[PDB]
């Protein structure tokens, strides 16, 4: 049975997610419009840049994150941002569609669309397969937000100083998640192990995105299509 | 009577302008959409960033520009780009409207719209007054493109090394323009002097834009709305 403290953590993570995932997708009309080889890059760079702002907002409300040093906060967001975006995008992904549905018809994204932004199928094929594997787990929203927080608060990320402080934060969240699944998720005996495997999947996806981003960022006619916030977060400065 | 060499200069400048001013304005649908205090900044930053690319294309076809060193080319574009954009925008400005009409209704710009991108009336009131004063001159297209080239090739700009080389280029263009007006422009005895005064007007406008841009660029929630190419060209690096 979960304690009040463990329950307060769940409450605060759910509220944080609800404050920064917009189910109406109303901001997408603000992006440079989609065009359907690099024709989707303006739209999808704007989309990812927007999502980064949402991940930053979410992170700032994870209990303990804001007390870390500014350097550790930056280090955790720079290495985990693409992973959190992939994770949080599962709530618009559909097994029936194999697509991300974000409101209107202009903002439904195939595999055909997302291969038109400078990235190839060696990133996009594992990403789609990760989405369906994750969707099939049928996570409660409590499990979904806990996984995002655990992913964000991984101490084995380049640039973090206070390893022990953030590992302590992560272990607390892991404890919450294991107890949640045991008490509240019928048939979830194997679920925690599968969720941890998805964290490994994300590391692999992160590596492939980072390798391919280096190609874009070295071609100035492509990098000039990105946003300042994307250049900062996926850039190599320390 | 104009020589063949002076005539070849006019031909090449007109062709250069026709290659990089798109009378159909078809690319404007690619920008982040207008929103009608900072609500026009995404759209107008995209608009200005697009215009910078066009000015670079124009500059690369001015006889003599491409033979300057890469540093001098960068120095001339960084100090003159905003002036060339203000100048070239006169071909969509209307005395009847006091607006810039760029194709469809979403891309007609009032004084009300262009005050919604972080800049105030101490830039926008002189800019509009400059537009009507320029429009009233009824420049031939030959005079218009020559003025843009002369403005671009001003040696009294910060960062230029080869002053004497680019002053020589500018004097040639000035000679062309004075002879053009005398032979081909009826009643143009006072025109060259007025065009030179507009170059002074642009310096003042440049100074005010640069001062106000510093405000935007120091507020990261605003500068993050700009494009990488805008940050490069209006930035302070040497």
């Amino acid at each position: 049975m979960l304690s009040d403290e463990q329950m307060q953590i769940i409450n605060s993570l759910v509220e944080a997610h609800h404050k920064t995932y917009d189910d109406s997708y109303s901001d997408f009309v603000r992006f440079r419009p989609p065009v359907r080889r690099l024709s989707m890059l303006p739209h999808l760079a704007d989309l990812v840049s927007y999502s980064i702002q949402k991940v930053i907002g979410f992170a700032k409300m994870i209990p303990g994150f804001r007390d870390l040093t500014a350097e550790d906060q930056i280090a955790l967001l720079k290495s985990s941002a693409i992973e959190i975006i992939m994770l949080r995008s599962n709530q618009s992904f559909s097994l029936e569609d194999m697509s991300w549905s974000c409101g209107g018809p202009d903002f439904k994204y195939c595999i055909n669309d997302v291969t038109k932004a400078g990235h190839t199928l060696e990133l996009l094929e594992p990403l789609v397969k990760f989405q369906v594997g994750l969707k099939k787990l049928k996570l409660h929203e409590e499990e979904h937000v806990l996984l995002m927080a655990i992913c964000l608060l991984s101490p084995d990320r380049p640039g973090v100083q206070d390893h022990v402080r953030i590992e302590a934060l992560q272990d607390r969240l892991c404890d919450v998640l294991q107890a949640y699944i045991r008490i509240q998720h019928p048939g979830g005996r194997l679920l925690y192990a599968k969720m941890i495997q998805k964290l490994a999947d994300l590391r692999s996806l992160n590596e492939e995105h980072s390798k391919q981003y280096r190609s874009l960022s070295f071609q100035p006619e492509h990098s000039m299509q990105l946003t300042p916030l994307v250049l900062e977060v996926f850039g190599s400065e320390v | 009577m104009l020589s063949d060499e002076q005539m070849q200069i006019i031909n090449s400048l007109v062709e250069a302008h026709h290659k990089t001013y798109d009378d159909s304005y078809s690319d404007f649908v690619r920008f982040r959409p207008p929103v009608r205090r900072l609500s026009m900044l995404p759209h107008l930053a995209d608009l200005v960033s697009y215009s910078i690319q066009k000015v670079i294309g124009f500059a690369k076809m001015i006889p003599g520009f491409r033979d300057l060193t890469a540093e001098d080319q960068i120095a001339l574009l960084k100090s003159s780009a905003i002036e060339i954009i203000m100048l070239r925008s006169n071909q969509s400005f209307s005395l009847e409207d006091m607006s810039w009409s760029c194709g469809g209704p979403d891309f007609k710009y009032c004084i009300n719209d262009v005050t919604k991108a972080g800049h105030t009336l101490e830039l926008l009131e002189p800019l509009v007054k400059f537009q009507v004063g320029l429009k009233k001159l009824k420049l031939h297209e030959e005079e218009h493109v020559l003025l843009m080239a002369i403005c671009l090739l001003s040696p009294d700009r910060p960062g230029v090394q080869d002053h004497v080389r680019i002053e020589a280029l500018q004097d040639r263009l000035c000679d062309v323009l004075q002879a053009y007006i005398r032979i081909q422009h009826p009643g143009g005895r006072l025109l060259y002097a007025k065009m030179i005064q507009k170059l002074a007007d642009l310096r003042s406008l440049n100074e005010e834009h640069s001062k106000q841009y510093r405000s935007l660029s120091f507020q990261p929630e605003h500068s993050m709305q700009l494009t990488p190419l805008v940050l490069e060209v209006f930035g302070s690096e040497v």
Binding site: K60, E237 | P220, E221
Partner: peptide, 10 residues
């Protein structure tokens, strides 16, 4: 260094 990130983190 990381001007926008710092601002967004408050």
């Amino acid at each position: 260094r990381h001007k926008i990130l710092h601002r967004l983190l408050q």
